[PDB]
Amino acid sequence: RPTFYRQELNKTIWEVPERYQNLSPVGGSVCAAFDTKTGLRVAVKKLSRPFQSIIHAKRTYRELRLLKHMKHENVIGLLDVFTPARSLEEFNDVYLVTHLMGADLNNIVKCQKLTDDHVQFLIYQILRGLKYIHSADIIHRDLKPSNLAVNEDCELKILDFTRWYRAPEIMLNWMHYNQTVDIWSVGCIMAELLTGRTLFPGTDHIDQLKLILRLVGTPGAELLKKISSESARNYIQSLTQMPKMNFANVFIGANPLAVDLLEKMLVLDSDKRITAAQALAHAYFAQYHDPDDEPVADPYDQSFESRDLLIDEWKSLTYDEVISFVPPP
């Protein structure tokens, strides 16, 4: 058990292994810090109201279990996790420590116009991390430029687990989402890397859906066939019957292989969207693809997801997970 010290940043207290120094707010609350032990800049995150309700307590546990399991180059991982509390009885606060990646993809696209080679590599690393996430049977569900950290070498990590990058079926609360909701996201992000502009900058919920329909067109008979509801099913007919656009004509001048990949991500029907593993074999990534260096995750026990427990059950399990934590090499 290390030594802790106390300090107030903005309007909140932090107690941290003394090895963590120069705490400075960045936006639970987050602080950048220097890891005196390893010599590297870190992010330390203090979980808001970890055990306030049953839902929060389950979310805390989910969050830790998830991040504990993420061991991949293109996915954020845990350097450390600590509480100031000795014993479960005292246990009330949880801190997570990860790499301070010092620029995100939004920051990169605003300033620099990226080449074809840049977008192959960036999207390639997204799909690579994504293949690993999906192979644990997890859906990210919030991929966007600000959830993607990028260094000087234009190397990328997925952060996470606005609506411009959200699959239309989440916006319609369709339920049982499949993993290709993240693929939709990747398609929006890639369109934006290619053009420098947000593909679907909706002002609100319906606007979002409006701009989507103008690009990819109103649902095809094959898709309408799958819409359980007389409800949803009409209104659609009643809409200005839009043509699916030619992506060739929208992303004019882009690599035609990139344009083909985009048609395969930005399909309305989630059943027809390319998967992360299939996209990695797409000819667009021929320069970067290596079928032996695109690993999948260990099996992720998420049976907890289906259980309804008492707050103290959730916290104790969270405590076990703090105690069980082994740092990476």
Binding region for ATP: 26-30, 45
Q: Is 208 in the site for ligand BOG (CB under 6 A)?
A: no
Instruction: Answer whether 195's CB lies under 8 Å from 251's CB.
Output: yes
Catalytic site includes residue 160? yes
Q: Is 270 in the site for ligand BOG (CB under 6 A)?
A: yes
Binding mask 154-183 for ligand BOG (x = CB under 6 A): --------------xx--x-x-xxx-----
How many other β-carbons are positioned within 10 Å of the β-carbon of residue 164?
A: 17
Which residues are known binding-site members? 26-30, 45
Q: Is 269 in the site for ligand BOG (CB under 6 A)?
A: yes
271, 298, 305, 312: residue in contact with ligand BOG (rule CB under 6 A): 271
Residues 6 or more apart in contact with residue 38 via CB below 8 angstroms? none
Structure tokens at 189: 């992000």
Q: Which among 53-61, 62-70, 262-270, 284-292 is the span making contact with ligand BOG, rule CB under 6 A? A: 262-270
Looking at the Cβ atoms of 174 and 288, the one nearer to ligand BOG is 174
DSSP state of 286: T
Cα-based distances in Å from 179 to 90, 111, 164, 280: 39, 31, 18, 15
Instruction: Answer whether 68's CB lies under 8 Å from 56's CB.
Output: no
Looking at the Cβ atoms of 12 and 278, the one nearer to ligand BOG is 278
Residues 6 or more apart in contact with residue 127 via CB below 8 angstroms? 186, 276, 279, 280, 285
Looking at the Cβ atoms of 109 and 167, the one nearer to ligand BOG is 167
Question: Would the CA dihedral through 268, 269, 272, 277 be positive or negative?
Answer: positive
Size of the site for ligand BOG (CB under 6 A): 15
Q: Is 207 in the site for ligand BOG (CB under 6 A)?
A: no
AA letter at 210: K
Nearest-angstrom CA–CA distance, 64 and 85: 17
Report which secondary-structure segment, H or E, holds 136: none
Nearest-angstrom CA–CA distance, 59 and 44: 18
Residue burial 254-280, b: 16+ Cβ < 10 Å; e: rest = beeebbebbbbbbbbebeebbbbbebb
Binders of ligand BOG among 116-135, rule CB under 6 A? Answer: none
Q: Is 139 in the site for ligand BOG (CB under 6 A)?
A: no
Q: Is 205 in the site for ligand BOG (CB under 6 A)?
A: no
Looking at the Cβ atoms of 90 and 271, the one nearer to ligand BOG is 271
30, 54, 209, 277: residue in contact with ligand BOG (rule CB under 6 A): 209
Instruction: Answer whether 314's CB lies under 8 Å from 60's CB.
Output: yes
Looking at the Cβ atoms of 93 and 169, the one nearer to ligand BOG is 169
Q: Which among 1-9, 54-62, 109-117, 219-227 is the span making contact with ligand BOG, rule CB under 6 A? A: 219-227
Binders of ligand BOG among 74-113, rule CB under 6 A? Answer: none
Task: Catalytic residue, from 116, 142, 160, 269: name it.
Answer: 160
Minimum distance from residue 183 beta carbon to ligand BOG (Å): 11
Binders of ligand BOG among 222-251, rule CB under 6 A? Answer: 223, 226
Minimum distance from residue 90 beta carbon to ligand BOG (Å): 44
Looking at the Cβ atoms of 57 and 268, the one nearer to ligand BOG is 268
Cα-based distances in Å from 42 to 31, 37, 65, 156: 8, 11, 20, 16
Q: Which residues bind ligand BOG (CB under 6 A)?
A: 168-169, 172, 174, 176-178, 209, 219, 223, 226, 268-271
Active site residue ranges: 160
